[PDB]
Amino acid sequence: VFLCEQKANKTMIKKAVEKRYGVKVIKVNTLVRLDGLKKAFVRLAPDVEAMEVATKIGLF
Amino acid sequence: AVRVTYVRKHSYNTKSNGIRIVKTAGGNMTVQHRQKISNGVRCGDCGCVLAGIRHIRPHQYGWLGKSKRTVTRAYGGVKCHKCVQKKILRAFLINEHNLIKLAAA
């Protein structure tokens, strides 16, 4: 789950996530919050596991 | 009895907002969206409903097979068989009469 700019569509976010973390993305759902930010739910491919990305990013 | 609720955000009993309530596992009843009742085709002359063609929505005819949207006959799908028979006799009898009346009477 990421917070992204409103002016970015689902295609831009999917490509951006792949470029930033070198992973595979299969589905992106976006909701625009009240404050103005766009919350994106990026689901990765089954082979790539999101626990390794979370610790590599630093969420844990 | 189990009472139900509209699933979509339409809240009025409009023609396009028709629903059906069907039973479902656990005794619950769910809501379906039923299609509008449509008319078929009509003969171009006598205005009678043609046989052999289903009464569905206009776009659903493209989904049907090529043979299921017409009748294998001259003017099939636009004119009834009675409509067609009168067309043939008119075309032949009038032409034959023209050969005898005029055109070397």
Binding site: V32, L34, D35, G36 | K9
Partner: protein, 50 residues
Amino acid sequence: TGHKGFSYKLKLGKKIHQNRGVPQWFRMKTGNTINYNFKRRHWNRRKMGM
């Protein structure tokens, strides 16, 4: 309403963001008179008319 235009929704969100009090640290500044936000409102008290 459940249905709203995109621009209208953002103007709703700002009104939510502006309905906040003074942070405590700003209240400890020297020569500070701004203790409470007099532009505040609540849904059941004053309708923001938008």
